[PDB]
Amino acid sequence: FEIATTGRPGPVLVDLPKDVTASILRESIPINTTLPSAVSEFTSEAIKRAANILNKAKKPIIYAGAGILNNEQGPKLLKELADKANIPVTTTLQGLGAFDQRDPKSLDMLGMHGSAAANTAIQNADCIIALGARFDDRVTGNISKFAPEAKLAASEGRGGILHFEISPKNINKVVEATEAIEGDVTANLQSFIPLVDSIENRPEWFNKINEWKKKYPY
Amino acid sequence: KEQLMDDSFIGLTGGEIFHEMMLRHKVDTVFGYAGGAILPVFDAIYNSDKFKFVLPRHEQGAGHMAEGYARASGKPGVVLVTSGPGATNVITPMADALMDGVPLVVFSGQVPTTAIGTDAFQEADIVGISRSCTKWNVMVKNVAELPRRINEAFEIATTGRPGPVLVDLPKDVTASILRESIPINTTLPSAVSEFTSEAIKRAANILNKAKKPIIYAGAGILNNEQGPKLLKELADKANIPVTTTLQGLGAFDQRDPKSLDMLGMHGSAAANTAIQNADCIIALGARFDDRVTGNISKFAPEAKLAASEGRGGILHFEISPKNINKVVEATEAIEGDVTANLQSFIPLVDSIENRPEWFNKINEWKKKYPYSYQLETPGSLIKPQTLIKEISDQAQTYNKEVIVTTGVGQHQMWAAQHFTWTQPRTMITSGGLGTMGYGLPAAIGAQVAKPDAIVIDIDGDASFNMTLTELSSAVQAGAPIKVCVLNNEEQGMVTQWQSLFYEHRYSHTHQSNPDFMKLAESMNVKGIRITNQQELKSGVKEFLDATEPVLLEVIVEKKVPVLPMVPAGKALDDFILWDAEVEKQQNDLRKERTGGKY
Amino acid sequence: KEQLMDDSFIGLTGGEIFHEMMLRHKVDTVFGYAGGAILPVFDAIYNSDKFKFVLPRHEQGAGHMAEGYARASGKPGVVLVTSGPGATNVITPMADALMDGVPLVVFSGQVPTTAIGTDAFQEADIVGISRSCTKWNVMVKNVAELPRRINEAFEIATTGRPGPVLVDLPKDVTASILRESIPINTTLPSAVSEFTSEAIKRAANILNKAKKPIIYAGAGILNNEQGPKLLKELADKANIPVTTTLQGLGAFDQRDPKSLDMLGMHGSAAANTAIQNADCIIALGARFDDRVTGNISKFAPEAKLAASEGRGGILHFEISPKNINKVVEATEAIEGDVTANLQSFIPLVDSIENRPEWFNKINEWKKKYPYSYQLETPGSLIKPQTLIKEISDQAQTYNKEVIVTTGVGQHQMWAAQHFTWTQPRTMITSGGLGTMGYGLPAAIGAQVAKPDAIVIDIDGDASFNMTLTELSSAVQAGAPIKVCVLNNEEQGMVTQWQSLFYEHRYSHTHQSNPDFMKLAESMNVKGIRITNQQELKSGVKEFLDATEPVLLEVIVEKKVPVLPMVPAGKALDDFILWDAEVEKQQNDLRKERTGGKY
Numbered sequence A: 001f002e003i004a005t006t007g008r009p010g011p012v013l014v015d016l017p018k019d020v021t022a023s024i025l026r027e028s029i030p031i032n033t034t035l036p037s038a039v040s041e042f043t044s045e046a047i048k049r050a051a052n053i054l055n056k057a058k059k060p061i062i063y064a065g066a067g068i069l070n071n072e073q074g075p076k077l078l079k080e081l082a083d084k085a086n087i088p089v090t091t092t093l094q095g096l097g098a099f100d101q102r103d104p105k106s107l108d109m110l111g112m113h114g115s116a117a118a119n120t121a122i123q124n125a126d127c128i129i130a131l132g133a134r135f136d137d138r139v140t141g142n143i144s145k146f147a148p149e150a151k152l153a154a155s156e157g158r159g160g161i162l163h164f165e166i167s168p169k170n171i172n173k174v175v176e177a178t179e180a181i182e183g184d185v186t187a188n189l190q191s192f193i194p195l196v197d198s199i200e201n202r203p204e205w206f207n208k209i210n211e212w213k214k215k216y217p218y
Numbered sequence B, C: 001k002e003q004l005m006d007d008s009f010i011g012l013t014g015g016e017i018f019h020e021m022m023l024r025h026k027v028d029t030v031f032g033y034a035g036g037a038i039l040p041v042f043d044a045i046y047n048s049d050k051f052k053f054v055l056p057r058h059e060q061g062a063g064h065m066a067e068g069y070a071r072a073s074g075k076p077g078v079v080l081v082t083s084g085p086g087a088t089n090v091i092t093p094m095a096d097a098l099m100d101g102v103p104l105v106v107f108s109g110q111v112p113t114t115a116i117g118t119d120a121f122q123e124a125d126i127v128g129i130s131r132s133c134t135k136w137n138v139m140v141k142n143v144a145e146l147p148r149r150i151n152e153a154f155e156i157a158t159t160g161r162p163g164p165v166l167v168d169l170p171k172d173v174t175a176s177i178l179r180e181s182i183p184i185n186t187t188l189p190s191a192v193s194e195f196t197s198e199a200i201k202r203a204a205n206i207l208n209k210a211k212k213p214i215i216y217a218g219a220g221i222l223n224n225e226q227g228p229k230l231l232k233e234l235a236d237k238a239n240i241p242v243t244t245t246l247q248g249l250g251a252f253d254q255r256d257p258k259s260l261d262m263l264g265m266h267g268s269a270a271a272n273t274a275i276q277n278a279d280c281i282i283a284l285g286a287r288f289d290d291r292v293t294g295n296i297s298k299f300a301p302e303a304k305l306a307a308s309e310g311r312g313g314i315l316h317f318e319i320s321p322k323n324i325n326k327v328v329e330a331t332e333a334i335e336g337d338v339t340a341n342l343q344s345f346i347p348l349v350d351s352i353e354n355r356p357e358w359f360n361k362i363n364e365w366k367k368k369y370p371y372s373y374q375l376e377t378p379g380s381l382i383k384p385q386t387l388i389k390e391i392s393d394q395a396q397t398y399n400k401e402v403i404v405t406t407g408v409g410q411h412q413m414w415a416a417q418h419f420t421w422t423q424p425r426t427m428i429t430s431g432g433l434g435t436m437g438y439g440l441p442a443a444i445g446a447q448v449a450k451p452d453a454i455v456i457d458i459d460g461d462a463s464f465n466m467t468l469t470e471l472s473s474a475v476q477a478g479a480p481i482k483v484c485v486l487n488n489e490e491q492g493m494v495t496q497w498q499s500l501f502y503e504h505r506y507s508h509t510h511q512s513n514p515d516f517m518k519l520a521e522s523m524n525v526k527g528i529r530i531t532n533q534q535e536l537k538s539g540v541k542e543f544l545d546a547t548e549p550v551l552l553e554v555i556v557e558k559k560v561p562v563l564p565m566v567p568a569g570k571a572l573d574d575f576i577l578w579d580a581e582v583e584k585q586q587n588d589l590r591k592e593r594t595g596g597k598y
C-alpha cells in the first residue's frame, strides 16, 4: 500500500501461497508491521531560481498534467499561480479537469490531437511551467523541434522549462529541465507562488493567445 | 506513537548510521577496500575503536577472508567495498558463499542515485549481476530505510540456510543526513509444527526398525553449538556408525570407533560401501551433492528397498525446503534446524546396546579400505599424503585449537583424508563452487576470528598463485597464519583427469611458479623450504613453532592420483582403489606416452 | 540442398569443432585456464600450432590480458575458462570491457546439461550473472548449433559498439560428437540510409556557419584504420582545434598546433575552456561520459545557444543509438561508423584557411593553462609528474612503437597528461569501470598482440598489488613488458579526495607494500629501484634498454594532488588550478591535522 500510493502512484502485486493464507500465526510480530504509516536545501534553492526565471518571462505558459490531481489542493494552487502571474493554462489528456476550461486563460488540451492554439502557444512560449506532466510523445510532437522559444530563452538566461516532478526518473528524461523541482507539485507550489511576482496584464502575449484561440477552434 | 517512533538517528549521515548499526549487530570485524562511491561510509568509520578493519590487496581477498571469518566464528562475515570493479570483484566470493551456505553480508558503494542508469563512472549493475549468487539483495534508495535494510540483510544471511546478501549503497544516500523519525523496530536487530512433530515420530519408528543404520552428517549440524553434541548422543544411543561430508568434517570425532570417515568421490571406500548397504540413512544437515552420491540412480540401493518394504529408508533433517526431495526422495522429511529437531527425535529413539552383524561388516570394511598410497622409497620425493600426516600429527601436540583452510585440488582431498578431524569448524574449504585461491585469504579471516588458534592453509601451488598477494595483508593484519604449499609444480587434480581420461595429454596444466622463498621474503613473511624426506619432520616443526606468518614450501611427488576415486557415472561403491603394481604400470605408460617428460 | 548443407564437421567432438572455428575466425591467441568442465575443449586444442595459448595465474588476468590484446590489435580478445569460479572470475573483465567498448569473446565451460540447475559441482549461473555485463550471451545446448553460436558471438562482439559476449559450453556438449549435417552458412564467419545522408548534409551546413568549432574525439575514431587519417583531414580542411577523451588519446597527433590535449575532470583547462566557449561541437566516437562533461546542465553553453539561434550546436557521430541523445541533445545525430560517415561529411565541409580570433583565444588559453605542478626541490623526492615526462621523452627515442597501459589512480591521470600522444591504440587504460589491477595483465596482452612494441605499464603501488601474481605469466609467455610502479605508498587518488573533502581523514587508504625488488626477483623478473632525483635519468634508461620483463620501482612524492581538477557538480570551466602557495598551505594544514603523520 505504501509503495503503490507514494512517489508516482502505480501498481504492486502481492503473491499469496495457499498454505500461507491457510496457516495460522503462532508467534508475536513487530507491532509496527500491524499498522499502516521538510523540503531539502537543494530543492528550496531550485524553487527560488525557478521563481526568478518566471518573473522574467514575457510569454509564460502552464503545462499541467495528472500529477496536479494527486493532491486535493492541486487544482486550487494551479489556479492561484495562473491568476497571480497571469498565465495561460494547457493540460494533457490526463490533466483534463484540473483547470476550469471556461476560464479565459484556458488553452484546452495540447498534443497530437490537442488544440492548435495550445500547440502554437507552447511552441512560442519563453517559459514553460510543467506541473505533474511527463512530456509524453503524444504531447511533444517531434522532440528536437519541441518548445523552440523556451530553449532559446533558457540559453539566453531569460526563461526555459520549469519541471515540477515527483519521480526522478521522469526528470530530464525527454527534455532538459532548466530547473527541476523534485517532490509533490502541490506542496512545492505552496513555496513557489509567494516568490512569484503578481502580474496584472500581458497585453501582447494574451493578444496572440486570443487570436490563436479564435482561428483554431475544434 | 512517540513510543513507536525513534528520532535518535536524526542528524546522522547514512555513513554514521551504518556505523551505529554495525555496533548493534555485534559486528567486531569488517573486511573491505575503499573507493570514491563508498567514501562517506569510510569517513564515518574513520579510526573507529568499535571493530577491527581488515584491508586486503584485492576485494576477492576481502570476500574470502570474510568467508573464512564466518566459518571459523559462526558469525556473519561483513564486507565493505566501493562501486563498479570493487563490487564485481566480490562476485566469486558471493557465489562461493552461496554454494557453501556461508553467511556473508556485502556492502557495496554505488554511484549517486542521480547517476544510476547512465553508464556512470564506475557504475556496475551489481544488484542485477549478484542476483543469482545471493539469497537476497537490495539497493538503499534513501537514508531513512537504511537501518531497515541492514536489519533485513543480517536476518536473511543468518537464517534458514545461511548465505550471502548484498546491500547497494548510493553515495548520495550515505552522505545524506536523516531528517526524520523512523520506526523504532527498524533501529533494532531481531514452536514446532504439528506436521513436523508427526514426521519426527514416524522417523523414529522407522529407525527403531533398522538393522543397518548409518548417519550421513553435513555442514548443517555445525550451525548450532549443540549440533555435534546431539549427533554424538544419537549415534551412541542407537549405536550408529557416522560418516560425514567434506563440509561436515570435525562434526564427529574421527577417533571414535563409530567413525566411518568421509564419504563420496574421494571419500573412504568403507564409508561408501556402508551407505550403499545401509537400510536406514539419517541425513543430518547435508544436501546429497553430486560429489557425494555417485551415480544417483544407483545410490543407496538398500535404503530404497527398505523404504519400499516399510522397514527403513532415508530420514532427511533439512532446514531448506528447496533441498528436500531435490536429489533423492526422502522417506521422511524433517523440516527445520537439525539440532533443534534432534532434541525431539532422540528421546523417541530406542536405545541399542549392540549390532554384532552390522558392525562386524563395518569393521571388516574399515580394515580392508584404508587410505592406502605408495610410500616414499629411497631417494624419492616426499609423498603428499605423508606430508599431510606429518602436519596432522605434529599440529595435534600443541595446546591450541587447530583450524585448517585449503585451496582446491589434490592437496585439498589429501588434507580431507589424512587429517584426523575432531572439532567443529576446523575444516574451512571451498566445496560447492571449489574456488582456487580460497586458502590464503580464508586463513587470514579465520585467524582474525580466532586469534589464539593455529591456522594452517594447506594449499596447492597453482591455487596459491591465484591470490598470493594477500600475504602482505596477513602481515598488516597481524595474522600469524601458516601456509603450506604442496609444490608438485602442476595443476595436479586436472592432470589426474588428463592422465585417466585423456591419455596423458596435459593441455596447459603446468603453470610456472615463482621462487616461494624469495616471495615470502618480499612479503616480510618467514620462509621454509622442505626439499627431501630427511627434512620433513624438522621442517614441519619449525613451521608450527613459528609465532609469525610463515610460508612452508614442500617439494612433493608429481603425477600421483588421489585415491580412492568414484569416477563420474559410477555407483558410490564402484570405486578405484590404490594398487602398487597399477601405479607402477601407470608411471611406465605416462613416461612412454610423454617421451619421458612426465 | 546438398549445396546448402555441410557434413565436413561430422565425426568431430564439440571441442574439435571449437578449434576449427577459432581458425576460421583468424584467432591467433587464446587466453585461458583449465578446469574439469572445459577439459574436452582443452584436449582438442592440445599442442595446437594454430594459435598461441597464454596462461595467466588467475582468470581475471586472462580477461584483462584479452582486453589489452584486443585494444592493441583491433581484434577480439578470446578467453577460455572452466565452469563455476573459473567463469565468475572473468566477471570484472567483462564489465570492464562493456564500459570501454572492448570486443571480448568469453568461452566458459559448464557442467553437463544433465546437471544444470541442480546446484551441481562448480556450477554457476554464469548466463544469468553475466547478463548485465555482456552485449549478449548464450548457452550452447547441442554440438550441432555450436558453430552458429560461435559465429554469432564474434559478430556481436565486433559490430556496433564493440563489447564482451559469453558463450557457455556444457561439458557433455563439447565432448559429444556431431552426427548430422549442419547449414553451411553456420560453418563460415561473415549503403547509407536516406535519413543519415540528409543528417550529414545538414550537419555540414551547420559547421560551415561556425566561427568557433571544436572537435571532441573519442575511442570510436580508433575503430577504423582510416579513423585518425580522416579526423586529421577534417581538422585541417575546416581549420578546427581537436581535443580528445582519455580513451581517444593518440587519435590525434598532440604535437600538432591544433591539439588541445585531453578534456574533462583532469583534462587541460585550455581544452575545457574551449569546449565551453565553442559554438559548434563535433563529437566523433565519444559518449559524453560524466568524467568529461562536468555539470551537465552547465555543459557547452555556447554550443547550446548557437543551436537555438540556428548557427551551431552539437554534431554527434555515433554508432550506437543508445548513446545518441542519452546525455546531451544532439543538434544533428549521424548514426553509423564515424569514419565511414566522415568520408561523406568532409567533401561537404567548406575549406577554411584562417580563424584569427578563435585561434588567438585558443593559443592564449593553451599558454595560460599548462599542466603545471610543484617541481623537485633540493633533497625532495621525485615528483610523479616529472617521472612520467622522463619516461615519455626517453621512450620516444627508440625506433619502436610505444604502447602504454596503466592502473587506476593518480598515476593514470598523470600518464594521460604528461605523455605526448601521437599514435592510435597506444593508450590502453581502464576508463569506464576503472579497474585497479588492469595495468599488468593488459600490458601482457598488448605485448602478445604487438611482439615488437615497447609496452610500458605505468602502475600505482595499490593497483599493482591487486594482480602482481601475473608477473610469472609474463615470463612464461615470453612477454618483455616494462612495469613502472609509482610508489607513493598510498591509494593516492582516494587520499586526494580525503584531503579535499574529508579534512585529511585518511580512512584505510594506506596498504602495506611488499619489497618490489625482492618480489621481481622471486618472479624471475629484472628489478630496478629509483629512490632519488639523481638516479631518475639513468634508472629510466636501464628500464627502457632492458630486453626482458622488467619491474621499475620509483619512490615518488606523497600527498600530491592531480591538477587541474573539475570537482563534482562544477561546470567544466570551473576548475581548480595548481598554485605553489596553495600547495604549501595545504601541506601545512595536512601536517597539523594529522599531527605530522602525513
Ligand SMILES: Cc1cc2nc3c(=O)[nH]c(=O)nc-3n(C[C@H](O)[C@H](O)[C@H](O)COP(=O)(O)OP(=O)(O)OC[C@H]3O[C@@H](n4cnc5c(N)ncnc54)[C@H](O)[C@@H]3O)c2cc1C
Residues within 6 Å of the ligand: A007, A008, A009, A064, A065, A066, A067, A068, A070, A071, A091, A092, A093, A094, A095, A109, A110, A111, A112, A113, A114, A131, A132, A133, A134, A135, A136, A138, A139, A164, A165, A166, A167, A170, A183, A184, A185, A186
Ligand atoms: C489514441 C490516443 C491519443 C492521445 N493523444 C494525446 C494528446 O493529443 N494530448 C495529450 O495530452 N495526451 C494524449 N494521449 C495520452 C498520452 O499518451 C498520455 O497518456 C498523456 O499525455 C499523459 O498525460 P500526463 O503526463 O499528464 O499524465 P502521466 O502520464 O500520468 O504523467 C504524470 C507525471 O507527473 C508525475 N507526478 C505524478 N504525481 C505527482 C505529484 N504528486 N507531484 C509531482 N509530480 C507528479 C508523474 O511522475 C509523471 O511524471 C493520447 C492517448 C491515446 C490512447
Ligand SMILES: Cc1cc2nc3c(=O)[nH]c(=O)nc-3n(C[C@H](O)[C@H](O)[C@H](O)COP(=O)(O)OP(=O)(O)OC[C@H]3O[C@@H](n4cnc5c(N)ncnc54)[C@H](O)[C@@H]3O)c2cc1C
Residues within 6 Å of the ligand: B099, B100, B101, B160, B161, B162, B217, B218, B219, B220, B221, B223, B224, B244, B245, B246, B247, B248, B262, B263, B264, B265, B266, B267, B284, B285, B286, B287, B288, B289, B291, B292, B317, B318, B319, B320, B323, B336, B337, B338, B339, B408, B409, B413, B430, B431, B432, B433, B434, B493, C121
Ligand atoms: C575437488 C573436490 C572434490 C570433492 N569431493 C567430495 C567428496 O568426495 N566427499 C564430500 O563429502 N564432498 C566433496 N566435495 C565437496 C562437495 O562438492 C560439497 O561441497 C560437499 O559435499 C557439501 O557438503 P554438505 O552437504 O555437508 O554441506 P552443504 O553443501 O553446505 O549442505 C548443507 C545442507 O544442510 C542444510 N542446512 C544448513 N543448515 C542447517 C540447519 N541448521 N539445520 C538443518 N539443515 C541445515 C543446508 O540447507 C544444506 O541443504 C568436493 C569438493 C571439491 C572441490
Ligand SMILES: Cc1cc2nc3c(=O)[nH]c(=O)nc-3n(C[C@H](O)[C@H](O)[C@H](O)COP(=O)(O)OP(=O)(O)OC[C@H]3O[C@@H](n4cnc5c(N)ncnc54)[C@H](O)[C@@H]3O)c2cc1C
Residues within 6 Å of the ligand: B121, C099, C100, C101, C160, C161, C162, C217, C218, C219, C220, C221, C223, C224, C244, C245, C246, C247, C248, C262, C263, C264, C265, C266, C267, C284, C285, C286, C287, C288, C289, C291, C292, C317, C318, C319, C320, C323, C336, C337, C338, C339, C408, C409, C413, C430, C431, C432, C433, C434, C493
Ligand atoms: C580516475 C579516472 C579519471 C578519469 N577522468 C577522465 C578525464 O578527465 N577526461 C576523460 O576524457 N576521461 C576520463 N576518465 C575516463 C572516462 O571515465 C571514460 O572512460 C572516457 O572519457 C570515455 O572516453 P570515450 O567516450 O572516448 O570512449 P568510450 O567510453 O568507449 O565511448 C566511445 C563512444 O563512441 C561510440 N563508438 C564506438 N565505435 C564507434 C564507431 N566505429 N563509430 C562511431 N561511434 C563509435 C561508442 O558507442 C561510444 O558511444 C577517467 C577515468 C578514471 C578511472
Ligand SMILES: Cc1ncc(Cn2c(C)c(CCOP(=O)(O)OP(=O)(O)O)sc2=O)c(N)n1
Residues within 6 Å of the ligand: B407, B408, B409, B410, B411, B412, B434, B435, B436, B459, B460, B461, B462, B463, B464, B486, B488, B490, B491, B492, B493, B494, C033, C034, C035, C036, C059, C082, C085, C086, C089
Ligand atoms: C578459479 C578456478 N579455476 C579453475 C579451477 C579448476 N581446477 C584446477 C585448475 C585445479 C588444479 C589445482 O592445482 P593446485 O596446484 O592448486 O592443487 P593440486 O596440484 O594439489 O591439485 S583444481 C580445479 O578444480 C578451479 N577449481 N578454480
Ligand SMILES: Cc1ncc(Cn2c(C)c(CCOP(=O)(O)OP(=O)(O)O)sc2=O)c(N)n1
Residues within 6 Å of the ligand: B033, B034, B035, B036, B059, B082, B085, B086, B089, C407, C408, C409, C410, C411, C412, C434, C435, C436, C459, C460, C461, C462, C463, C464, C486, C488, C490, C491, C492, C493, C494
Ligand atoms: C578494484 C578497485 N577497487 C577500488 C577502486 C577505487 N579506487 C582506489 C582505491 C584508487 C587508489 C589507487 O591507488 P594506486 O596506488 O594504485 O594509484 P595512485 O596512488 O597513483 O592514485 S583509485 C580508485 O578509483 C578501484 N578503482 N578499483
Ligand SMILES: COC(=O)c1ccccc1S(=O)(=O)NC(=O)Nc1nc(C)cc(C)n1
Residues within 6 Å of the ligand: B035, B036, B037, B083, B110, B111, B112, B115, B120, B121, B122, B171, C290, C493, C494, C497, C568
Ligand atoms: C565513484 O564515482 C562516483 O561515485 C560518481 C559517478 C558518477 C557521477 C558522480 C560520482 S561522485 O561525484 O558522487 N563521486 C566521485 O566522482 N568519486 C571519485 N571520483 C574519482 C575520479 C576519484 C575518487 C577517489 N572518487
Ligand SMILES: COC(=O)c1ccccc1S(=O)(=O)NC(=O)Nc1nc(C)cc(C)n1
Residues within 6 Å of the ligand: B290, B493, B494, B497, B568, C035, C036, C037, C083, C110, C111, C112, C115, C120, C121, C122, C171
Ligand atoms: C566440473 O565438474 C563437472 O563438470 C560436473 C558437475 C556435476 C556432475 C558431473 C560433472 S562431470 O562429470 O561432467 N565433470 C567432473 O566431475 N570434472 C572434474 N571433477 C573433479 C573433482 C576434478 C576435475 C579435474 N574434474
Ligand SMILES: [K+]
Residues within 6 Å of the ligand: B254, B261, B416, B417, B418, B419, B420, B421
Ligand atoms: K581422516
Ligand SMILES: [K+]
Residues within 6 Å of the ligand: C254, C261, C416, C417, C418, C419, C420, C421
Ligand atoms: K599530453
Ligand SMILES: [Mg+2]
Residues within 6 Å of the ligand: B409, B460, B461, B462, B486, B487, B488, B489, B490, B491, B492
Ligand atoms: Mg599443484
Ligand SMILES: [Mg+2]
Residues within 6 Å of the ligand: C409, C460, C461, C462, C486, C487, C488, C489, C490, C491, C492
Ligand atoms: Mg599509490
